[PDB]
Amino acid sequence: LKSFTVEKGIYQTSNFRVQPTESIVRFPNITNLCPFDEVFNATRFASVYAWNRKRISNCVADYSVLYNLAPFFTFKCYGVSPTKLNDLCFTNVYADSFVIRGDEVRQIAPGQTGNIADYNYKLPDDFTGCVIAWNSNKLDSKVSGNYNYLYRLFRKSNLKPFERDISTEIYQAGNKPCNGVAGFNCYFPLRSYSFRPTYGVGHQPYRVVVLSFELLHAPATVCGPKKSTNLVKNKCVNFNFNGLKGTGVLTESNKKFLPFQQFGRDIADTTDAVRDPQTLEILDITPCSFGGVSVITP
């Protein structure tokens, strides 16, 4: 009432809530460290149209080794926070490791426009992942140019995101027919930049790895390094189910989950039922006990 004297009657005051007693962390019991060395510490990085999509699943992705890796420095991320990257669980991770010109490194981003972003490697606008780059001028640039990397500056149309095009047929740049014969307005599509150590820093070759995550309501195969605890039922506790945090009471439930389903949602689109990742059991989440408090005084 913001007063020192209180009249008679009944006054509503602050509500009461049962605080959690313990904390539960529950992660799937994968014990294999993730092979990021085969993606990053590889001796040779493939070309642009050698669209090598490394599939990452059933890992324990410790990102501290990647953060303290010697060659790769930049760690740009969209949709997630890098300091949170050791705390989440992803269903599948996909890695794309290329070598690109440093002028178009900025084109490796959603919503960009250019030769690379149109005809080489396009990211979707709802891309949730990270981009990692290193100036690879010391290794991937050779004397008098390296011609292993190819670029298609002209095409019929732009590429849809996460697609590749390895067709070597001659595209008619002009309106005249070319009949599969090279010439004026009938150039070869896959040209090269021929990276040299004597080039400028903008035109130096760069090793780039794009990590794309899949944050869905699906069972998770990639998870950060975290130790799972025991399960406590019928008690108001804090919980962490596969990076999904909350506070409530976990109870046994008779919900008939489909085999592809992981989480359940109510009318208000909050999480109501979870699946325990270690033992396949369905748990209902109930908010802890609360209510209104009133003071009856003269």
């Binding site: 999509r53 996909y94 996460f162 697609e163 699906a218 919900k255 489909l258 389903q261 359940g264 949602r265």
Partner: protein
């Protein structure tokens, strides 16, 4: 040959458990009472893919073994090939036509894993090929028309192939009929029952009564 699609083409748009709720979604669905092409096994013409294919097969001896996808399909670009020989499922992206088998009909990604009605939904979104599957035992007196009923198709396969796909063709076992329909971007109202199963759906772009139901 053409026939009616009835109320088929309803699949789960997400992997979230919802029970006893009318949920409105917007996705590539098969429209209600659309007009599906019917083929009888004597007959595998090349058909356009559009934005998605509902493939229904009424069989008992499993004549249809799989599909081939792609734009040109003559070893000039990528071509997805899905074969099942009742033991293992082979999915390849190899450019080769490779139409040789005991039955009459570069590899950057390889994945190895009338009483019967098999329903499939194929759609390629953002470089991801999504295959939704359902199987049911139904006995029909005539396979000339598509069977009337309601069925929900569970999601089965997601592939990060990233292949432009415009044409497709089914494959047959030689030494039984199928229906092809095309998907459209539609708003649907799905009824999740106590079990969580979609027991009914309303297409919001069918008639003013269903538009009123959706509003």
């Amino acid at each position: 040959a053409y026939t009616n699609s009835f109320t088929r083409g309803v699949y789960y748009p997400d992997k979230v458990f919802r029970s006893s709720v009318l949920h409105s979604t917007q996705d590539l669905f098969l429209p209600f009472f659309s007009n599906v092409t019917w083929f009888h096994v004597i007959d595998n013409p090349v058909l356009p893919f559009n934005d998605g294919v509902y493939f229904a097969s009424i069989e008992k001896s499993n004549i249809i073994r799989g599909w081939i996808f792609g734009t040109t399909l003559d070893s000039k670009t990528q071509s997805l090939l899905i074969v099942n020989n009742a033991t293992n499922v082979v999915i390849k992206v190899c450019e080769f036509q490779f139409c040789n088998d005991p039955f009459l009909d570069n590899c950057t990604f390889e994945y190895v894993s009338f009483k019967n009605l098999r329903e499939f939904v194929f759609k390629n979104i953002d470089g991801y090929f999504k295959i939704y599957s359902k199987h049911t035992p139904i006995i029909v007196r005539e396979p000339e028309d598509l069977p009337q009923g309601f069925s929900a198709l569970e999601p089965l396969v997601d592939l990060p192939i990233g292949i432009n796909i415009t044409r497709f063709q089914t494959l047959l076992a030689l030494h039984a009929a199928y229906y092809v329909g095309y998907l459209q971007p539609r708003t649907f109202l799905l009824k999740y029952n106590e079990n969580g199963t979609i027991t009914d759906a309303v297409d919001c772009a069918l008639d003013p009564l269903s538009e009123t139901k959706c509003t």
